[PDB]
């Protein structure tokens, strides 16, 4: 549940727990974040409120 990435089920580091890529507050790993934005097939937006990253 808490202190875990909801996508890859990995222990959230101290650099990840303080990472808020979207104003909604949905937190994911630094690797899952970059995966979404870069991967050609992926849309590159927040898995929660579908807000585009910047």
């Amino acid at each position: 549940m808490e202190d875990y990435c909801p996508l890859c089920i990995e222990p959230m580091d101290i650099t990840d727990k303080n990472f808020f890529p979207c104003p909604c507050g949905y937190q994911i790993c630094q690797f899952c974040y970059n995966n979404i934005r870069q991967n050609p097939e992926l849309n590159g937006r927040c898995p929660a409120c579908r807000r585009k990253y910047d």
């Binding site: 909801p6 996508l7 890859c8 949905y26």
Partner: protein, 150 residues
């Protein structure tokens, strides 16, 4: 090494066993974690009431960043489900989210059986009947339910 997709599936599997399955049921086919067999009940609101529908679920290697290949095993008469069992669900394609769990998807399928979308059909022949002769659609949908799903 260990796949990220492998863990996400295992976590959802844990949440489905802890929480009550309710009007649904889903488990991994044998040992393979990427092959699941679901089984949801037909909603009372829908004309699919009384029937139990089985599904085939195939998770991709880059799950949950890609939707699972979900299809119907039981022959169903629906404007958004064809003869192969493939579902024309928006949240599956071009509306998918890595946060959306399998539970959310199965629930969305239930919410599709109750309220179809003939505006964006998968089977034009049924959607045409759905718009012009709803009573005829309702009758056939129940006949197929009592014949295949029962």
């Amino acid at each position: 090494t260990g796949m990220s997709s492998s863990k996400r599936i295992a976590k959802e599997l844990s949440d489905l066993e802890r929480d009550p399955p309710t009007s649904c049921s889903a488990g991994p086919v044998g040992d393979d974690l990427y092959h699941w067999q679901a089984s949801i009940m037909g909603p009372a609101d829908s004309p699919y009431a009384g029937g139990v529908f089985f599904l085939s679920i195939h998770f991709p290697t880059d799950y949950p960043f890609k939707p699972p290949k979900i299809s119907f095993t039981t022959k169903i008469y629906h404007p958004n489900i064809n003869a192969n069992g493939n579902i024309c669900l928006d949240i599956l394609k071009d509306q998918w989210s890595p946060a959306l769990t399998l539970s959310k998807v199965l629930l969305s399928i239930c919410s599709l059986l109750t309220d179809a979308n003939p505006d964006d059909p998968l089977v034009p022949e049924i959607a045409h009947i759905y718009k012009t002769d709803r009573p005829k659609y309702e009758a056939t949908a129940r006949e197929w339910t009592k014949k295949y799903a029962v």
